[PDB]
Amino acid sequence: SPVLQSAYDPSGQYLCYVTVALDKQRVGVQPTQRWNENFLYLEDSKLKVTCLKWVNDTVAIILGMNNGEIWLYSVLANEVTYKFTTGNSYEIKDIDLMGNQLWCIDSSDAFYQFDLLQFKLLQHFRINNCVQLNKLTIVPAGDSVAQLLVASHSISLIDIEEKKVVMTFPGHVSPVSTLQVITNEFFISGAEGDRFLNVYDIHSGMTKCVLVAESDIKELSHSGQADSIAVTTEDGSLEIFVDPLVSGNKSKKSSKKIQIVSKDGRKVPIYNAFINKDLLNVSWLQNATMPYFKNLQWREIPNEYTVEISLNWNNKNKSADRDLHGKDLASATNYVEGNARVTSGDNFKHVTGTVTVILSQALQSNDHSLLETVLNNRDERVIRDTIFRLKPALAVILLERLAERIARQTHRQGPLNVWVKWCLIIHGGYLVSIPNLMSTLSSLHSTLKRRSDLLPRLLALDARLDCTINKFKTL
Amino acid sequence: QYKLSVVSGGKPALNNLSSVTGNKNIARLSQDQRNYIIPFNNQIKVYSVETRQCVKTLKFANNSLLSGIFLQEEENNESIVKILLGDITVPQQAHLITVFTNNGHVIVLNYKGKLVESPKHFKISLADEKLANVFHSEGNYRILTTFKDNSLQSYRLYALTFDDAKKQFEVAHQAEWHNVILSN
Amino acid sequence: VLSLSFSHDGSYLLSGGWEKVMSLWQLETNSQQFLPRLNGIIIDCQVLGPQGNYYSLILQMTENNSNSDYQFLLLNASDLTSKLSINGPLPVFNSTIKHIQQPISAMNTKNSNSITSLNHSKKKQSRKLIKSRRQDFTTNVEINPINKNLYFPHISAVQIFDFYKNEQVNYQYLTSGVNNSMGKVRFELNLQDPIITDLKFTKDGQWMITYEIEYPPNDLLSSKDLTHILKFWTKNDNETNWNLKTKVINPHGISVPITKILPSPRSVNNSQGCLTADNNGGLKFWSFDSHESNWCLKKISLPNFNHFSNSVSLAWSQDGSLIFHGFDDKLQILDFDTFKKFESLENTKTVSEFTLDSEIQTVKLINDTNLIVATRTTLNAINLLRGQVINSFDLYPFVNGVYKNGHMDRLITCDERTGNIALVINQQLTDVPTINYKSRIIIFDSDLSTKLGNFTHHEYISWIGWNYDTDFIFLDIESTLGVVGTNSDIFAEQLHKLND
Amino acid sequence: KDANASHPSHSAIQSLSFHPSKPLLLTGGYDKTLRIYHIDGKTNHLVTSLHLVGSPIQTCTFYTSLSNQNQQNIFTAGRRRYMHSWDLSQTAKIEKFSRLYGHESTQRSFENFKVAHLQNSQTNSVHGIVLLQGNNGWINILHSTSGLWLMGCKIEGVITDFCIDYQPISRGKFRTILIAVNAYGEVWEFDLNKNGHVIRRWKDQGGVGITKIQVGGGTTTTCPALQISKIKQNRWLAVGSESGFVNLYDRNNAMTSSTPTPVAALDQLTTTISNLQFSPDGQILCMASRAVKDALRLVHLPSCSVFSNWPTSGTPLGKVTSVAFSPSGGLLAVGNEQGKVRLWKLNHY
Amino acid sequence: STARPRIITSKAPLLPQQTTPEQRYWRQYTSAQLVKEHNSVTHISFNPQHPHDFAVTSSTRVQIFSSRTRQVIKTFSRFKDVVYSASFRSDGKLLCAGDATGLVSVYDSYNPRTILLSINASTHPTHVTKFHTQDNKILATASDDRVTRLWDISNAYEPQLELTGATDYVRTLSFIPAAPHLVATGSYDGLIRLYDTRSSGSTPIYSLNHDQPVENVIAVSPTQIVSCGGNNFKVWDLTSNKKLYERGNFNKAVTCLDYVENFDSPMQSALIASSLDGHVKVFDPLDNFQVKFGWKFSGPVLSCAVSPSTAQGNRHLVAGLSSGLLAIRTKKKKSNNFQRMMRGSEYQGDQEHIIHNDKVRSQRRMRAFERNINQFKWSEALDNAFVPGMAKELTLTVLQELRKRGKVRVALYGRDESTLEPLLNWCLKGIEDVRSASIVADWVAVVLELYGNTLESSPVLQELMIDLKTKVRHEIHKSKEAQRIEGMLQLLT
RNA sequence: UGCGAAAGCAGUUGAAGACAAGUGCUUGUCGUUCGUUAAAAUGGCCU
């Protein structure tokens, strides 16, 4: 993780996170309920934030600092309003506050009570048997802050006004990470590197329950009357135990489990959820440090939820003004023609020594070699007697082949013209019989209509050629 | 039952009834260079520059005052001469606009808000002649007015300011030219 | 030169001609880098950022000699790319609207003005529209029905334009001309690009068919003959570039104007066919050869009428049985299966040949039941249950020579469930007509007897069509599309807003 | 921990860059792919990648404008005829300066460039300029928000490198100077404020084949300014040859005398100097060579003496292809041919 | 802005008989070579499995030709009298060959020296010897003994099952794709006989009449069989037992037949039929057997085959010709330091957050006339249009759109006799043709209306204009008569 | 210019004013007004 520390404020609208940047730590606050470049850089590279706490009359947050100091920072003006000091120089292991009394466990194993409004180091002690210390919580004893809990690897409760340790519950093997007072009587410890949370009673001083988590625990937030516990599991997952304080019934598993995942399946790691009555507010780091949040409602979430985010993993860069491709949206397009079918408006499709035996063979088959040689024969008496000896249906197909040949070779038009003319002359009657004459003889119709369209320009140009030839021919 | 109404408007109506001056554009980019204001023939649209869409329309048909000003259909000739961004009656409260039409009306409007039915409208009197241009450095504002007694017009140059009262506009004569063929 | 404008430091100058390039001269070495093609002459250019980020420039679309077609441009400066292009609906009216002139050029051609000609021609237009009563400003508009996008055929190019978003969405060139390859300047300005005269959509939505006539440049051997072209275009409903699928040269043979086009009703080939109707009287019927993949003739009808009439209108029975083909002073009803007229075997005066008083401007059918004809003098309504005329109405009061032939077809259409719409146009005067205008719409029921609506418009109306959501849209002079139809929160505001 | 560690490059690192205000790093190679890493010490993560298709990279520059302090750009360039300009949350705003105006015959490739501010002087408005090498002596200067051509300066011979150095004049006034090294050694110093006019020229003593000139000690294209009051004139000048030598001049005395003596002449490396960076406060010169493995040396200035105990024998360096120095935290970031950048902290800062 | 429009080359409306698509592909099949043979070849059989080889019989000689080298490979020549049918197995391993003495031999193809299993059929000749396709080990042979047999090639002492009921000279048999147990047979008396073989087989399951003597039968589906004999052929739908189609557009009798499916073609399926006249004509059962293409090999033709659907190489079409001729038509198909220095170039952006290509993609190059009309030099556009080897379409294109720009006089001012003359030669050809007569009329009209006096002065332009005069008169004649025939035809309608 | 078809058939080119040139005189021009249906300056298209 890149975020060294975090904390929600109460009422879950502003997350304070502290993170490093070219090795000078900076704190920074964000909204979460629907930006902030109002960071706070530390100056030296040798003081680090060691504890965070919010306090509710600006909103201010308290930075227990590795120097041996306690900074109080108003969030609005980026101003460290006041730096209380301990008298000494040791990293402030813990900070807590309730009302106006700030307590800090110093790494001289020592307890300091400061007064906020008075801005003054009130009291200053150490007690026996609290050998090293790591975490602290002052109890809700009403308004009076007596008899607070401090924990090394093993929890201990101490009474202030006589500064004597009153009780002691079996702690953990590792040092405690999380330690919170969950009810009037119950409090949870939970130890770093352990997947376990112990739920103790204060008065009877024995374990009420143990809550396990499917992986190691990293953070913890808890709802109103201990109705809900949302534990941030360091694999990057979020377990909520629903109502852990009622009744095989010592080790409770986790009820619901929430993961977060991008579209293409990549896991994304949650850190530091926040919960309240029916409203869970998770977090994750979207780009390399920037945090993104989400609300959701867990009473009606299903049991194992993989909430999804769209994360622009490999997308293709579209520009707004540019098109899908290269063109830009103030361009007219262009007349592209390509492979359209281009056609006229007269396309009436879809609406005694003869040779007649060779001709009729070729026409019943399609022998272009043989039609070739018979059309090569040229003299007109042969032509007329041949077409007369031909059967008439085959002469219709003769017209078809003849027309195709004229249109593709308009230099043949003479001899093929006498062929088509004599054919028409002889076998006219059958053509009168046939009903859809045009829809058969499109090709002849098309060729002849084209040249007949063409005529008058040729005539006008002939006149103009005659003009110039006469002009320089007379002189 | 059957309803006739206007839905789509068209033309942008370039500053043509000038027919003289060489800077025909009226439409003006914002100060924060993020949105473009186009004066259409029957509305004003606000285009976001970087997303190339229309993020707001300002319809004279919907506003009762604006239809009374512009769309009195017997005389369309109330026609926008200039748009200015920051509001004139107040020094730097923003997102407002002051609109100057052909016959000395200034309208104070908004965008990125809601056009509540109270535009701050003021009228420049003193003008038997016609507004031609309004343009400014800081503070002191200048007015050109087309004017007449060759079939060519005359230009008159005025100095303009405010604070006299909320509807009062100081105008003082500064210059004049008689028959202008071109001006830029 | 139409625009000159400096940069801020005064070392670059932007220049602005008819020649549609935009030229940047750098002044220290008189060097330059233009912007070759732009859709129209640039009437103003300007440098608008602090540091010269954007150049805005107003450009005229000067092809259309009937309006004033501006387009606003805002060019991103680094890239020379259009960060904004702003535009209105651009129809082409019949001839010029109220006191709108043309820009200034070197010569006076049919596209611009010389100087002399500018002053004189402004006088001429003002006088003409005061005096002569003949005037019409009627335009063609189609609606792509699946998209409900208004297709305005500008000359030689369509402008696809929806009206809900008012955002002009495409501008497509639909004829090989000199459309972009150049900028015309002088005698080049005296040239002419082929005109999209008609455009129609099959009811399917996937096919448009268009008719556009080709002009030859003057003073040639062949400066006389136009060449008319039909074209069949397609698209998928996702894509926006209409593709050309069949170009037909010379429908009905040489030099004959396809002056009425009808898309087919869905029954005949799932609405994939069309009628093309000439001015001599001829008919043709094209549809989609589907074993091939293109369009063809299927049915013809060539009557040699020696005579010409530029007013033909037609309509198709919804079952596809028959075709009303109204022609000059005439209406013939045709059997679809034959392209021959339907014979009265009853002989009970259910004849196929109705002769009417004036020319025929419009023939429609509200259902299978009523046929409706607009004639140059009168509006007639006939019912085809029993062959009797039902109603008539007087229009020769308002329609004298006010429109050319067929533009009443584009004024009046019919909704295909309920009723019918008619449109009347007046100009105002005190003591000789002025240039003001005012129209009135009237909605009639299918009986063509009861007036379901009588509304007024304060400026001239140019075209009506029925948007397929059972309403009507109408265009205008002033280009508007009108519709006819039925601790915690105090803390919040601060973070949201946040020498020596 | 290695800055690339999280997303390993596919070609050699060609040009690194630290952002002048935030804690970012930028890397690019012939891989065609900008990568912006958020820099911690422990973890170094990806803020963003971008793969510009078909186009290489051989120079990347972050660029924060000096008046606006929001116009933050990245400029990238390879052996092509164009420059890309990426501006700075889900999709990218990238232009490409493509067209030089009257005259591109003087440059047909955009791969060698720098960016630097400039003042108008008739109004006190400061804009980018982009400086590009060219064909025979030509340096072409473009305005940087709108790609226009400003001015072009020809040095004789052939160019081989060029730096920028700024001079202050009054509050609201600076003056930028362009220094161009011929590969025979003759330095020309144009100034840009009035149109590019030769302030002076002096010869590098010695210097048969020069690659790389760089100034330092003040404000540069490698540690730039953030408001006009902070522009400081550079105290040192260094010139690095392709034999291996590096001459080192003081700016006070070299400007005064106009054919000066190098204060110190370093020869430690043996192959062709291909990087010269000064530290942002100007006390370390790191002179490095692209050409054989482990050729970074860090020089303490003013005493001009090579630091003797780092880099050692085991310093994992490889063929050093690019180097950067961090603006504030005192970090050094080196990138080689395998494509891995490694990152050190000079602990004094 | 806009990219510049390319010039639309002038496509005039289509004339009849246009280059059909199918014709494109089948006319690709070209590069024919001939091989003389000893005697009239009979049967050809492409190896099915790795389809690169084909067998072709002869007189007493079965040859294996190759495919990628189109030469001989191997020769089987141990046969006493002339050998009649040769066919590879399904899997490709074995070749079976039946000869006229009445014995068949099946032996390992590409291994001409292992006469691996010789089955003696009837003492009458066995014209047809085929391997079963669906199974791999039953050799279905025929005979001229009017009785065909299904031998099992494991034990060849007795026909495992027999099919009889012939009338005269069985010389064709076949199997069916989806059915394993149906055998179709074709004799010389019409009468395809369809046998089950799960019953006694002595009687056909049903017969299909074919009045004239059939000579080939091909299963072309699980449901259609094509029967090929006499002048035409006929395709039978088999479940409904009725003939669908019948196509007969040959001259003499058809001889052989082949059907091939799913090769890379616009035609999904093709059926090539061969008809003893040179004519090998190729048809298709998705356009209802309408003739698509045809070759005319010289002599009469006995067999044809195209290389199979899994050719993966250069495909072939062979036809074997009754005077001993094969005609084959075949359609073909640094330093390591340096790289580690410059190793990015082939990345193509796989694991990156955003990917941005905006490179322009290269058009094809512009010709010289398009360059001159891009850059407005009209005079050199026209001179660079009249080129010796330049497409008639292209000259018509530049003349067209130069006229469309409306710069004919402008493109023509500078000229003299020698700058004119090649235009006149082309105008000769242009008026000669019909698509261009309009446009060349425009151009020669202005040459006259502009350059008459120069035309007086020089003598050679007189030569051209006299000759163009006679040409254009003769063109009056050709549209003249062509209008008269429109009169002719209009009377007959 | 009106009618009309793509044809074509009908119809139209007026004064004033001022200025310029040549030399009161000859012609012209027009960022002028009434009155009818009323060619030019060596200069051409980005990557």
DSSP for A238-299 reads: EEEEESTT----SEE--SEEEEEEETTS-EE-B---EEETTEEEEEEE-SSS-EEEEEE-SS
Residues of D in contact with E355 (CB under 8 A): 50-51, 53
Locate B112 and state its tokens. 């990125």
| Option in A31, A346, A351 nearest C298 (CB) | A351
- Specify the resolution in Å: 3.9
Burial label, C422 (beta-carbon count in 10 A; 0-12, 13-18, 19+): buried
Query: Would you call C482 and B1 a contact, using CB atoms and an 8 Å cutoff?
Result: no
Q: H or E stretch including A79?
A: strand A79-85
**C117 CA to F20 C1' distance (Å):** 21
- E254 CB contacts (<8 Å, ≥6 apart)? E215, E216, E228, E229, E230, E231, E232, E233, E273, E274, E275, E276
Is the Cβ of C13 closer than 8 Å to some Cβ of chain D? no
Among protein residues, the one whose C-alpha sits closest to the C1' atom of F7 is C308
Verify A-B touch: 3 or more CB pairs within 8 A.
yes
Q: Is B34 on the interface with A (CB under 8 A)?
A: no
After which residues is chain A discontinuous, taking C to N > 2.5 Å? 34, 56, 247, 351
- Protein-contacted bases of chain F (C-beta within 7 A): 2-8, 30-34, 36-40, 44-47
By Cβ distance, the residue of E4, E8, E442 closest to C220 is: E442
Nearest nt (C1') to C188 (CA)? F44
DSSP H helical ranges for A50-189: none
DSSP-assigned letter for residue D228: G
E347 and D32 in contact by Cβ < 8 A?
yes
Among the partner-chain residues A344, A407, A454, the one whose CB lies closest to the CB of E479 is: A454
**Separation in Å: F5 C1' and C307 CA:** 8
Which chain A residues touch D94 with a CB distance below 8 Å? 317, 319
Q: How many contacts, defined by CB atoms under 8 Å, are there between C and E? A: 45
Q: Does an H or E element contain A408, and which? A: helix A392-408
Q: How far is the CA of C351 from the C1' of F10 (A)?
A: 40
Asked if E11 has any chain D CB less than 8 Å from its own CB, the reply is no
3-class secondary structure, B56 = strand
Q: Does A315 touch chain D (CB under 8 A)?
A: yes
Q: Does E2 touch chain C (CB under 8 A)?
A: yes
Distance to chain D for E334, nearest Cα, Å: 17
Q: Which residue is nearest to nucleotide F38 (CA to C1')?
A: C124
Q: Do D96 and C31 count as a contact with CB atoms less than 8 A apart? A: no
Q: Please tell me which residue of chain A has the smallest CA distance to B51.
A: A320
Using an 8 Å Cβ cutoff, are A152 and A131 in contact? yes
Query: Cβ contacts (< 8 Å) between A461 and chain C: which residues?
Result: 221
> Which residues are within 8 A (CB) of A459 and not within 5 positions of it... i.e. 6 or more apart?
E476
Neighbours of chain C (3+ CB pairs under 8 A): A, B, D, E
Nearest CA in chain A to E458: A472
Q: Which of A1, A5, A23, A289 to mutate to test the interface with D (most CBs of D within 10 A)?
A: A23
How far away is chain C from the Cα of A350, in angstroms, using its nearest Cα?
A: 6
Beta bridge partners, C333, equal: C324
Determine how β-strand E354-356 pairs with β-strand D44-52.
Answer: parallel
Nearest neighbour of A335 by CB, restricted to E8, E353, E468? E8
* C10 in contact with chain D, both atoms CB, cutoff 8 A: no
Contacts of D313 (CB under 8 A, 6+ apart): none
Q: What per-residue string of b and e applies to A340-365 under the rule 16 or more CB within 10 Å gives b?
A: bbbbbbbbbbebeebbbebbbbbbbb
Say if the Cβ atoms of A458 and E479 lie within 8 Å: yes
C window 26-85, beta carbon within 8 A of D: 26, 29, 31-33, 49-53, 76-81
Q: Which residues of B touch A320 (CB under 8 A)?
A: 50-52
Q: Which two tokens stand for residue A438?
A: 């045009």
Q: What are residue C392's phi and psi, to 5 degrees?
A: -140, 155
Q: 3-class secondary structure for C315-381?
A: EECCCCCEEEEEECCEEEEEECCCCEECCCCCCCCCCCEECCCCCEEEEEECCCCEEEEEECCEEEE
Paired tokens of A161: 């006004």
Closest nt by CA–C1' to C37: F45
Tokens of residue C485, six digits: 């139809």
Asked if C378 and C395 count as a contact pair (C-beta separation under 8 A), the reply is yes
Cα separation, C413 vs C363, whole angstroms: 10
| Residues in chain C within 8 Å Cβ distance of D120 | 9
- Nearest Cα to D19, choosing from D73, D76, D68? D73
Answer yes or no: are the C-beta atoms of E137 and E100 closer than 8 Å.
Answer: no
Distances (CA, A) of E468 to A414, E391, E415, E428, E464: 20, 22, 20, 6, 6
**Could you give the angle at the alpha carbon of C252 between the alpha carbons of C250 and C254, nearest 5°?**
55
Which whole-number Å values give the CA distances from A380 to A61, A187, A390, A405, in the listed order?
A: 117, 123, 15, 19
φ/ψ (deg, to 5) at E394: -70, -40
The torsion defined by the Cα of D228, D230, D236 and D240, in degrees rounded to 10, comes to: -60
What's the N-to-C CA distance of chain B in angstroms? 53
Rounded to the nearest 5°, which phi and psi values hold at A466?
-65, -40
Q: Residue E22 CA to F41 C1' — how many Å?
A: 63
Q: C1 to chain D, minimum CA–CA distance in Å?
A: 22
Mutation to test the D interface, candidates E336, E340, E348, E353, most D Cβ within 10 Å: E353
Task: Considering all nucleic acid strands, name the nucleotide whose C1' atom is nearest to the C-alpha of residue C107.
Answer: F39
Chains B and E are touching, with contact defined as 3 or more CB–CB pairs separated by less than 8 Å: no
User: CB within 8 A of B11, min separation 6: which ones?
Assistant: B40, B41, C68, C70, C88, C478, C479
Provide the CA C116 to C1' F30 distance, Å, integer.
8
Q: If we measure between CA atoms, which residue out of E195, E208, E244 comes closest to residue E224?
A: E244
User: Which residues does chain D have within 8 Å of residue E352's beta carbon, measured at their own beta carbons?
Assistant: 33, 49-51
**Burial class of residue A449 (count of CB atoms within 10 Å of its CB; 0-12, 13-18, 19+):** buried
Contact of chains D and E by CB distance (3 or more pairs under 8 angstroms): yes
Tokens of A367: 């022998």
CA distance C206 to C232: 10
Q: Which ranges constitute the DSSP H helices of C90-207?
A: 115-131, 187-190
Scan residues 158-177 of C and list those with Cβ closer than 8 Å to B: 163, 165-167
Length of chain D, please?
Answer: 349
Query: A413-426 vs A392-408: helix axis angle to the nearest 10?
Result: 160
What's the token pair of residue B66?
């604006």
Experimental method: cryo-EM
d(CA B43, CA B7): 11
The reply to whether residue A321 touches residue B51, judged by beta carbons under 8 angstroms, is: no
Burial pattern D7-40, b for ≥16 Cβ within 10 A else e, equals bebbbbbbbbbbbbebbbbbbbbbbbbbbbbbbb
Rounded CA gap, A47 and A52, in Å? Answer: 14
The CA distance from A220 to A222, in Å, is 7
Q: How many residues does chain B have?
A: 184
Q: How far apart are the CA of D61 and the nearest CA of chain E, in angstroms?
A: 19
A neighbour chains, 3+ CB pairs within 8 Å:
B, C, D, E
Q: Is the backbone of residue E337 left (phi > 0), alpha (psi -120 to 50) or beta?
A: alpha
Q: Residue C92: what are its φ and ψ, rounded to 5°? A: -120, 115
Residue E313 φ/ψ, nearest 5 degrees: -150, -160
The distance of Cα E115 from the centroid of its chain, to the nearest Å, equals 37
CA distance B39 to chain C (A): 11
**Does residue D56 sit at the E interface (CB-CB below 8 Å)?**
yes
* Token code pair at residue C184: 């015309």
Which residues on chain C are in Cβ contact (under 8 Å) with A328?
Answer: 81-82
Q: Can you tell me the distance from the alpha carbon of B159 to that of B176, in angstroms, rounded to the nearest whole number?
A: 12
The distance (Å) linking the CA of C184 with the C1' of F41 is: 20
d(C-alpha E264, C-alpha E270), whole Å = 11
* Residue A26: its H or E element: strand A26-31
